[PDB]
Amino acid sequence: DVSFSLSGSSSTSYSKFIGALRKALPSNGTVYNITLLLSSASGASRYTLMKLSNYDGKAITVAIDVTNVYIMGYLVNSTSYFFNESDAKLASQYVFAGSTIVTLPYSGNYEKLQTAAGKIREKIPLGFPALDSAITTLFHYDSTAAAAAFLVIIQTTAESSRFKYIEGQIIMRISKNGVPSLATISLENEWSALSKQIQLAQTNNGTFKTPVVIMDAGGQRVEIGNVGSKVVTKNIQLLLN
Ligand SMILES: CC(=O)N[C@@H]1[C@@H](O)[C@H](O)[C@@H](CO)O[C@H]1O
Ligand SMILES: CC(=O)N[C@@H]1[C@@H](O)[C@H](O)[C@@H](CO)O[C@H]1O
C-alpha cells in the first residue's frame, strides 16, 4: 500500500507520497519515457490501496484501479463505500474483505460527482487544508458533503500522480486553499486524449494524429500537436492504455 499523513506533512512528504503512488502502478513499459498503464488486470491485483490520514490522525483507506488510476471507493472503520459503477462493484468483490458494503448514490465520473456536490471542480478549493476537510468528511461519512470530498481527493491524489504540474499546484496550496487553475482543469479533461495521441505519435515521427487543446497558466488555449511539447516531456507521468 501507499500512505499520506497530513500530520507533519510538507512539500517533501507529499511529493514522496505521489512518487510512491506512481511507483505502485504496474506498467507494460514506457512510451516516450512515460509509464504506460496496464490494459487489463485481474482480481485483487487490479487495485492499489492508499491510506490517507487527516491532521487529527483519523484515517481512511482508498482503493484505486491500476488500469486507469480511478478511485473505486474507500474503507473507514468496518464500512466500505463504493462508487455506483460496474468497475467499482467489481472492486468490492476483491478489496476490503469482511467490511459492510455501501453503494454510493453516484459514479466516480466528474460530471456525476459535480451534480451530486451541487458545484463544479472549477469552484472547489484544493490544497492541504482542503484534503484534511475531505478526509474528515469521508471519515464520518457525511453523505451531503461526500461527493465534494471525492472531488478534492481525486484531484489531489490521482490527478497529481498523472501530472507533475498538478502535483505542483497542490504544493502551492499547502497553507492556503485555492480553486484549481484553468490549466489543471484542462489537463484533467484531456488526460485520456493526451494518452491516446502520445501513443499514436510513436509511429508518426512524434506528431499527434489529432491535436489536443490544453490551457496555459493564463487560461489561453494552447494546441498540442507533437511530443516536443512540455506537456509530454515534463508534465504527464502516466498514460492510459
Ligand atoms: C446494486 C449495486 O451496487 N450494483 C450496481 C449495479 O446494479 C449497476 O449495474 C452498476 C452500474 O452499471 O453499478 C453497481 O454499483
Ligand atoms: C462512517 C463511520 O462509521 N465513521 C466513524 C466516525 O464517524 C466515528 O467518529 C469513529 C469513531 O472512532 O468511527 C468512524 O470511522
Author numbering: 1 to 241
Task: Quote the authors verbatim.
Luffaculin 1 is a new type 1 ribosome-inactivating protein (RIP) isolated from the seeds of Luffa acutangula. The ribosome-inactivating proteins (RIPs) are RNA N-glycosidases that inactivate ribosome by cleaving a single N-C glycosidic bond between adenine and ribose at A4324 in the 28S eukaryotic mammalian rRNA or at A2660 in the 23S Escherichia coli rRNA. The removal of one adenine from rRNA by RIPs prevents the binding of elongation factor II (EF-2) to the 60S subunit, resulting in the termination of protein translation. Luffaculin 1 not only possesses rRNA N-glycosidase activity as expected, but also inhibits proliferation of tumor cells, induces apoptosis and differentiation on tumor cells.
Here, we report the high resolution (1.4 Å) crystal structure of luffaculin 1 and the protein sequence derived from this crystal structure. The crystals of luffaculin 1 belong to space group P1 and diffract to 1.4 Å resolution with synchrotron X-ray radiation. The crystals of luffaculin 1 contain two enzyme molecules (A and B) in the asymmetric unit. A comparison of molecules A and B shows that the overall structures of these two molecules are almost identical with rmsd of 0.181 Å for 221 Cα atoms. The structure of luffaculin 1 contains two domains: a large N-terminal domain composed of eight α-helices and eight β-strands, and a smaller C-terminal domain consisting of two α-helices (α9 and α10) and two β-strands (β9 and β10). The electron density of luffaculin 1 clearly indicated the existence of two well-defined N-acetylglucosamines (NAGs), each covalently linked to an Asn residue at positions 77 and 84, respectively. Although the sequence of luffaculin 1 is not yet known, the high resolution of electron density, combined with the known sequence of homolog luffin a, has allowed us to undertake an 'X-ray sequencing' method with a high degree of confidence. The existence of two independent luffaculin 1 molecules in the asymmetric unit allows the cross-validation of this X-ray sequence, further increasing the reliability of the sequence assignment. By using electron density and evaluation of chemical environment, 86% of residues were assigned with confidence.
